[PDB]
């Protein structure tokens, strides 16, 4: 059955889970760099210890992500009324599938990327039709989606087009946004602008 969350509860929980995840994701990147460095450089026991560690960390990540997605699909996005919340939960679905794809293998990688792209596209359709271009949930969607493109889908072309579009729609609407509303969004815009100038 269903569950609805106030914006502030949503943010609390989302932050908490992202804390956990990001710890585990960065650890995974580091273990892999050590793994590749040793794997190129020989070594018996040490490579075994490192591979076993990387495996254990992948296990934890997949377990957490899969649980997150099962509550999203089972309880949250069915219950979503507002358009901001629909976009929110569909973007979360994209995020956790993308983190699945970040380390996933072969067909598991392929399934994860497909599910992520479905979810981001769903978020996008709602964000277009219900959320201002300066809305932070929309700017976050744009940023994470373009990153999805560039890193996972490896379409720099499409990532950059998405990022520029979102940036400029915002910049356009900006002269017409309040004070307490605009300081709530500058930082996502600058992140999209930074990613973009990076990608050239």
């Amino acid at each position: 059955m269903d569950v609805e969350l106030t914006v502030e509860e949503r943010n609390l929980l989302s932050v908490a889970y992202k804390n956990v995840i990001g710890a585990r994701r960065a650890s995974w990147r580091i273990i892999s760099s050590i793994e590749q460095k040793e794997e190129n450089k020989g070594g018996e026991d040490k490579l075994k210890m490192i591979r076993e560690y990387r495996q254990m960390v992948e296990t934890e990540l997949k377990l957490i992500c899969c649980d997150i997605l099962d509550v999203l699909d089972k309880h949250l996005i069915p219950a979503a009324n507002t358009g901001e919340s629909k976009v929110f939960y569909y973007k979360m679905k994209g995020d956790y599938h993308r983190y699945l794809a970040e380390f996933a293998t072969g067909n598991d990688r392929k399934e994860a990327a497909e599910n992520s792209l479905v979810a981001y596209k769903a978020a996008s359709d709602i964000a277009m039709t219900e959320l201002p271009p300066t809305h932070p949930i929309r700017l976050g969607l744009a940023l994470n989606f373009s990153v999805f493109y560039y890193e996972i889908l490896n379409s720099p072309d499409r990532a950059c087009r998405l990022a520029k579009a979102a940036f400029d729609d915002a910049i356009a609407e900006l002269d017409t946004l309040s004070e307490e509303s605009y300081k709530d969004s500058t930082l996502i815009m600058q992140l999209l602008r930074d990613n973009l100038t990076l990608w050239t």
Binding site: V15, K18, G140, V147, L187, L191, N195
Partner: peptide, 6 residues
Amino acid sequence: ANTEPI
């Protein structure tokens, strides 16, 4: 590649 901040 910098995704949305916590």
